[PDB]
């Protein structure tokens, strides 16, 4: 189990 | 037609390649960002175990949390992809 | 400054405030979608125990899974945002 | 446990 942020360009 | 991107990814090459599918499908069937969410989230669930969360668009920030191997984000041309493991 | 509308909610009346709250305070603090989401989220995965999805944006689809009462959907102004829990 | 479909205005 991990975590990520994303972000549209 | 449209340009896939892989921006993230952490998960078996091959659920890749499976991804785009998904989604391309998806694009080719729906219009609606919801919808084409709907079809990928489903789709995972029937392949692969529950439980897959799918979010469609074209502007958003994520902050999620994914079991290990279970997680891609992307872009099919303009539309940017998240689809992740959790539950 | 910002006005809170909720558009679909499944979770306790005060914890609905509680998210406007935690939202109120990031969109203060942050600029970056993906940067108020992880903000919200890791506010809620400690009040609340994990595990906390967040997706803040102003275009996007989802189709998500969350455990029964840990869901809610809403604006802040023009941001969107879209905390449940699954996992 | 429940399922939800979102959609920006
Ligand atoms: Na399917
Ligand atoms: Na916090």
């Known amino acids: 189990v991990y975590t990520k942020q994303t972000q549209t360009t | ?87």
């Open chain 2, 1 to 87: 037609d449209r340009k896939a991107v892989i921006k993230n990814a952490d998960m078996s090459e091959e659920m890749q390649q499976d991804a785009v599918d998904c989604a391309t499908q998806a694009l080719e069937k729906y219009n609606i960002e919801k919808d084409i969410a709907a079809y990928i989230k489903k789709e995972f669930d029937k392949k692969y175990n529950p439980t897959w969360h799918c979010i469609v668009g074209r502007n958003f920030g994520s902050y999620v949390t994914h079991e290990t191997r279970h997680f891609i984000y992307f872009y099919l041309g303009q539309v940017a992809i998240l689809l992740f493991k959790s539950g």
